Amino acid sequence: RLICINDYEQHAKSVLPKSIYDYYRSGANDEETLADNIAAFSRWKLYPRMLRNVAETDLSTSVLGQRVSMPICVGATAMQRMAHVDGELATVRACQSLGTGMMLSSWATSSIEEVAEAGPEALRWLQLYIYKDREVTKKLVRQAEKMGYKAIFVTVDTPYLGNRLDDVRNRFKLPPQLRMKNFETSTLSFSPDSGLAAYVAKAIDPSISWEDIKWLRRLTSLPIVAKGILRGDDAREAVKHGLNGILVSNHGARQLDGVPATIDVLPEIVEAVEGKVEVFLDGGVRKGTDVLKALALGAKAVFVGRPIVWGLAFQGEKGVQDVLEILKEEFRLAMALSGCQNVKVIDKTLVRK
């Protein structure tokens, strides 16, 4: 049956209710950047070296000082219990099995504590939204620290929600038995136009600024990664504020439509930070060769969003494990066929635009 990431999406479309599949699939507006996140990878061509001895390929690397089995990590995707009853618990168990890390959404259908209990040995990070209520925001950070999470990925591209047309058409909301489990009140738990757009407008602070990054940097000694940066000047500002990484992201093409593909902006950002912090990528990673191209252009690791959700939709924990194993094996093969024994030898001469 399912032997590549595209097969998992096709299966997910066949089993999920329309409103759920559309929520997960959609980009903003006419979905120009959604298509380009994928198309852009195809424009970057590979220039493989032959005869390098690839009998012993080592995929391991490190993200913010923590070892991982491969440069392929799970990105934050909200509300995973819509895809499968075990949701984020399934995801974290699969990450533990694989030896990779999970970035947990602030809008998860499982709590910070529940996910740490299901994956005590898993490498786990918190994706943070800055809520108008700074006490809510502080509580999330404190829980993450108490529960053994190793970094904060602060989302900086979402002062408001992007306009995802199908969610407005479907009047997207959570199924009746589910909530955003990090919150106590009806409104902040998203108790069931787009419901989610209205939730953001009520809960999330559109005023946030670099001053808020200064606040967050004072709040926690955890490593902090700015997630959603697309400009070199903003990446330099993040470094100036004492942040510890940049996740080059257009939010899965769900925020501002018509921004570049992340693989296309990656080189400018890598150049801008001058080696001072790790740079990561997400957006459009579906194949081992996508991972290889991102590393050749300077990314330390990539994050996957939608493929994880499609794994859940097929078979819960087993489906997420399968998706991650597919990506791992495609990446090993790509490294081998390119002449790369390890991630340290994946260099810029492997790619040209």
Ligand SMILES: Cc1cc2nc3c(=O)[nH]c(=O)nc-3n(C[C@H](O)[C@H](O)[C@H](O)COP(=O)(O)O)c2cc1C
């Ligand atoms: C269904 C879905 C839900 C998402 N939820 C969140 C979220 O809660 N927090 C966040 O910072 N980003 C969120 N994102 C953005 C993802 O972290 C990531 O940037 C994106 O999924 C990467 O692109 P990909 O799906 O092509 O792999 C979401 C993306 C999707 C598709």
Ligand SMILES: CC(C)NCc1ccc(N(C)C)cc1
């Ligand atoms: C690997 C596991 C997820 N089983 C499904 C499966 C996935 C990929 C492949 N290969 C040979 C391309 C074979 C089988």
